[PDB]
């Protein structure tokens, strides 16, 4: 029942300061060294920092040394990572991790990690998405099935949630991971495969919710005559 | 301060197969090596510590071997639960990781169903055009998608998205989005999507003429 819960991640602008927290349960926190590790799509797993059980010794990766600071409040069972002068490369999921148990070993790794907190360093502002239909046609059909969908474009920050016919349609849906556009905004498509027979007698509406902007768009997808 | 490299970077295997992931350190780390398993959207979980010691609760089908600069992680018989990405970590000189090895499910080559979607008139009114090409339920993940406008190959104006491997049919699906200004869009006629894939003997092209859909 060793458990670590990270918090404090979010969207921040470059050059600002963000403090991450990590809360521990199921073991004596005061007695263990603790780590921060981060993971980007393009930098893999990268160790960030370690702090001794008593908060004395602290070591840092060169990529963050001088900008980040690790600390801890053992009276609160909480590890901290203070990030300063954030830059785009600091975008990652940040994991906190517990040092391996004391033994006769001279070298020590980690054994339990938390679920992670997401930090996004972005020069971008919150914006609701514009939802655009991906209309079915002869050019979207294969063997009695047709493909139709919705372009959810130019939104920030993540995530958006898509449902079809208010959730009553759940089979055949492929919702794609969002891409980050060079504009700084995100775009994703959600498509569904249905029988071509249904297009005349079945309505299909994509339901897009974007909680950051409190947007709820219902876009009906109509067949095109081609 | 020690570089770990894994090989292969992707492993395709079937349930019940014996699979072997190797990890190489740039210099000797004795036996200070750890093996992690990570599934998508989840944290890495420690499987093997100090080269060969299985952690509590990890099935015995997992075993690690090696010392110095060469290490191996072996799964005796693959379970569906074991399809994930595996990282090695040295912990003698700070803590560095290999790039990962994605063990994916092997299946028959499946060619993609290629669908194309013209931009919505609603988007054109806002002054932008997005064309979407969809490749559906295909294996392997590697695919070439080339946008062409009046047969002219596009470059720098497309973005691709691919799903995680499906649990049911173990296939992938992919979307490519060509974004143009309304004024760049209104300058050309034939908008086409050329797909090159192993399941296709020849590149398949789906296309539409502007104003004809």
């Amino acid at each position: 029942q060793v458990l670590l819960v990270e918090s404090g991640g979010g969207v921040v602008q470059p050059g600002t300061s963000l403090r991450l927290s990590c809360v521990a349960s199921g073991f004596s926190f005061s007695t263990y060294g603790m780590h921060w590790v981060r993971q980007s799509p393009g930098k893999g797993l990268e160790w960030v920092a370690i702090i001794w059980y008593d908060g004395g010794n602290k070591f840092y990766a060169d990529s963050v040394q001088g900008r980040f600071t690790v600390s801890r409040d053992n009276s609160k069972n909480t590890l901290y990572l203070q990030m300063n002068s954030l830059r785009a490369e600091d975008t990652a999921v940040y994991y906190c991790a517990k040092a391996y148990r004391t033994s006769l070993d001279k070298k020590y790794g980690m054994d339990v990690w938390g679920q992670g907190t997401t930090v996004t360093v972005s020069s971008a502002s919150t914006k609701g998405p514009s939802v655009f239909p991906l209309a079915p046609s002869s050019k979207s059909t294969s063997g009695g099935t047709a493909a139709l969908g919705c372009l959810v474009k130019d939104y920030f920050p993540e995530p958006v949630t898509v449902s079809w016919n208010s959730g009553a349609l759940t089979s055949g849906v492929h919702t794609f991971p969002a891409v980050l556009q060079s504009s700084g905004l995100y775009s994703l498509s959600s498509v569904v495969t249905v029988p071509s027979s249904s297009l005349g007698t079945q309505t299909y509406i994509c339901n897009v919710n974007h909680k950051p902007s409190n947007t709820k768009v219902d876009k009906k997808v109509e067949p095109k005559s081609c | 301060d020690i570089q770990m490299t894994q090989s292969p970077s992707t492993l395709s295997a079937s349930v019940g197969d014996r699979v072997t992931i190797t990890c190489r350190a740039s210099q000797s780390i004795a036996s200070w090596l750890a093996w992690y398993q990570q599934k998508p959207g989840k944290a890495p979980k420690l499987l093997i510590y100090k080269a060969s010691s299985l952690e509590s609760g990890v099935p015995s089908r997992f075993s690690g071997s090696g010392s110095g600069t060469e290490f191996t992680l072996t799964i005796s018989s693959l379970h569906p639960d074991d399809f994930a990405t595996y990282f090695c970590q040295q912990f003698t000189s700070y803590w560095t990781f290999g790039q990962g090895t994605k063990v994916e499910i092997k299946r028959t080559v499946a060619a993609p169903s290629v669908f194309i979607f013209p931009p919505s008139d609603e988007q054109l009114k806002s002054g932008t055009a997005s064309v979407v090409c969809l490749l559906n339920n295909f294996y392997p993940r590697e695919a070439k998608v080339q946008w062409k406008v009046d047969n002219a190959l596009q470059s720098g104006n497309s973005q691709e998205s691919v799903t995680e491997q499906d649990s049911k049919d173990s296939t992938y699906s992919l979307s490519s989005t060509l974004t143009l200004s309304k004024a760049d869009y209104e300058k050309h006629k034939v908008y086409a999507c050329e797909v090159t894939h192993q399941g296709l003997s020849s590149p398949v092209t789906k296309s539409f003429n502007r104003g004809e859909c």
Binding site: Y32, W52, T102, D105, K106 | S93
Partner: peptide, 11 residues
Amino acid sequence: ANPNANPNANP
């Protein structure tokens, strides 16, 4: 101290 040494209490 060495970073990879025992970071826990009572080493």
